RNA sequence: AGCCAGGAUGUUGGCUUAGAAGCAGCCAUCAUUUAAAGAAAGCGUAAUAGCUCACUGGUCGAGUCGGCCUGCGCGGAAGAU
């Protein structure tokens, strides 16, 4: 999550697993499922929805050029 | 205790130990009885006072049920509802913000008499010094 | 193993040895610290 | 470590305990944890506080440097690891007792208890002691003798 | 120095038999054996051997030191004999012993069959264990090594021929 | 306390001065008072160690030339341009 | 230097962090209980856990630690008939 330019905000500790909360940019969560699976032996749900618009890092911005 | 095996400790609250997001399920999960945290917990909880932090250990292996071990209160937190400020700084420690009492630290530390090593019971105050120089707060001694 | 012109210690566990004419560095903790040609 | 001066203190402070003391006992703390000391300090605690010691010193070089003073029964006690225990006030007391009971709770060895001085000799757990003030065990001796 | 300077006890049960530069040592096991020395000078007599520099050798002492050390261990061998112990880890890693040859199954497309040398003998407490006692220290070492070599312990599941007094570091698998 | 043994210099000149320093000695001079100045040769390492202590510069110090005890205070030191060595010392006469 | 032990209590120090519990960072670094034990030198943890070092008691039994000025050497050092 951190590697994906992601921000963390909590951990609960939900019963048996551990709900992990993070704000991470969309353009970086692509194909998340596949690696999450690899990292967790295949046992790890996840979910996402839109939250907000934040500043793109410079390298990002100048790349996003049409 | 002549054989430690499991001593998870994440302070709780006296008036109603029965959470869910902070601790809740996982505060007794791996052969632990979640139910018993209201029968046995509060059997020594309301004995004292209700509301503020209370660290704790349990003695469960794979023995289903269990007996709940009471504990001490932290010694620096007794610098909030028994002192003054409730944060700790506000202004970076470049400047020593807080403010302390010399009257207190004696009997209000003494409250933690049974969890300290100082033979002299006024020595125990001398320990609350730095513990209550938590920001560099000096006492109008 | 790093083959540098300077070898030096990296961990407090890295020992420095001279086998043949060569100056080596052995580390009992971290394989990344192995070194020759000092 | 420290230089000479500080060894002397380790002596003069230790040897004015013996010069002004009561009872003496041993123990070899190979495994002497810290829960160990903590406890026996609450024991020194009940047994006043800081009236007692145990200054590990069994360097013959130290806690025998107080012995050719008194208690030269300890040229023999001072080999290997050892924890010398001095009494100041108090009956020639209990100090003795829980040393056996303690080390009889696993609590490491006790040097087999090479034992100590009040008389001038060796080993054997004695509660010939803290009865002391059991001059009531000479009060029940008044009316019972007087009556019966 | 120190090791060289210290002497060495010869416990009853040892013969010991110096000639020139050739010590020898039999015991309750103890396949005799005879090493050679050089810039070192040995001395018999006593219940002990004593090693020291020989005049005109910058290597002396430094050399004398090893001499003692070696001799010492021979005796120790000839007394209690030397240990060993390697345990196999990983599915289907059996070991046998068919006389003086150890039959191992180490996930290979062929059998290994390692033939023990002279003064070493071996036995198998379990299909997953091997122990070899012997006289010569340096050799049981050698054998233990070569036996370990057929499959040195790998760091992800520690599979392979271990040492027991091992450590086998091991490390968490990559992030895929 | 600092006692500085010394010998009168038989040779003066850069040639002599240089040769001196090679043999772990070094030239110095004593002046002050009403009596003439004296060309000295001291041993480097001895004095080199001494001048390490700050007192050397503050305390009054004594020099033993042919057993005479002149007793002077350090006026000036010439240190090497880049080595931990002494070149020259001026001693003023009290 | 080895080897045997301890290596602790306030306490997860405060702040800061989703989490900083001796140990990512900012600030302070005291008091105990002692033989001695840093508000910790390193490894380690998501953070705790866990493994060490500093330091101390034991064993051993005579030397031992690292800087300064220096002489000679070692690596650094790969090419074409
Ligand atoms: Mg010239
Ligand atoms: Mg070449
Ligand atoms: Zn390293």
Curated annotation (Swiss-Prot), chain A:
It is found in: Cytoplasm. The modification N6-acetyllysine is found at residue 9. Disulfide bonds: none annotated. Belongs to the TRAFAC class translation factor GTPase superfamily. Classic translation factor GTPase family. EF-G/EF-2 subfamily. Catalyzes the GTP-dependent ribosomal translocation step during translation elongation. During this step, the ribosome changes from the pre-translocational (PRE) to the post-translocational (POST) state as the newly formed A-site-bound peptidyl-tRNA and P-site-bound deacylated tRNA move to the P and E sites, respectively. Catalyzes the coordinated movement of the two tRNA molecules, the mRNA and conformational changes in the ribosome. This is Elongation factor G. The chain holds residues 635 to 700 of 704 of the full protein.
Curated annotation (Swiss-Prot), chain B:
GO terms for molecular function: large ribosomal subunit rRNA binding; rRNA binding; structural constituent of ribosome. The keyword Ribonucleoprotein applies. Forms part of the ribosomal stalk which helps the ribosome interact with GTP-bound translation factors. Part of the ribosomal stalk of the 50S ribosomal subunit. Interacts with L10 and the large rRNA to form the base of the stalk. L10 forms an elongated spine to which 2 L12 dimers bind in a sequential fashion forming a pentameric L10(L12)2(L12)2 complex. The gene is rplK. The modification N6-succinyllysine is found at residues 71, 80. PANTHER family: 60S RIBOSOMAL PROTEIN L12, LARGE RIBOSOMAL SUBUNIT PROTEIN UL11M. The modification N6,N6,N6-trimethyllysine is found at residues 3, 39. It comes from Escherichia coli (strain K12). The modification N,N,N-trimethylalanine is found at residue 1. GO terms for cellular component: cytoplasm; cytosol; cytosolic large ribosomal subunit. Belongs to the universal ribosomal protein uL11 family. GO terms for biological process: cytoplasmic translation; ribosomal large subunit assembly; stringent response; translation; translational termination. Pfam families: Ribosomal_L11, Ribosomal_L11_N. HAMAP family: Ribosomal_uL11 (MF_00736). This is Large ribosomal subunit protein uL11. Keywords: Methylation, Ribonucleoprotein, Ribosomal protein, RNA-binding, rRNA-binding.
From Swiss-Prot, chain C:
It comes from the Bacteria. One of its GO terms (cellular component) is cytoplasm. Belongs to the bacterial ribosomal protein bL36 family. One of its GO terms (biological process) is translation. This is Large ribosomal subunit protein bL36A. Part of the 50S ribosomal subunit. The keyword Ribosomal protein applies. Keywords: Ribonucleoprotein, Ribosomal protein, RNA-binding, rRNA-binding. The keyword rRNA-binding applies. One of the last ribosomal proteins to be assembled in the 50S subunit, it contacts a number of helices in the 23S rRNA, acting as molecular glue. The simultaneous presence of uL16 and bL36 probably triggers ObgE's GTPase activity and eventual dissociation from the mature 50S ribosomal subunit. Pfam families: Ribosomal_L36. NCBIfam families: rpmJ_bact. InterPro entries: Ribosomal_bL36, Ribosomal_bL36_sp. One of its GO terms (molecular function) is structural constituent of ribosome.
Swiss-Prot record, chain E:
GO terms for molecular function: large ribosomal subunit rRNA binding; structural constituent of ribosome. GO terms for biological process: cytoplasmic translation; response to antibiotic; ribosomal large subunit assembly. It comes from the Bacteria. Keywords: Acetylation, Antibiotic resistance, Ribonucleoprotein, Ribosomal protein, RNA-binding, rRNA-binding. Signal peptide: none annotated. One of its GO terms (cellular component) is cytosolic large ribosomal subunit. The modification N6-acetyllysine is found at residue 43. Belongs to the universal ribosomal protein uL6 family. This protein binds directly to at least 2 domains of the 23S ribosomal RNA, thus is important in its secondary structure. It is located near the subunit interface in the base of the L7/L12 stalk, and near the tRNA binding site of the peptidyltransferase center. NCBIfam families: L6_bact. Part of the 50S ribosomal subunit. This is Large ribosomal subunit protein uL6. It comes from Escherichia coli (strain K12).
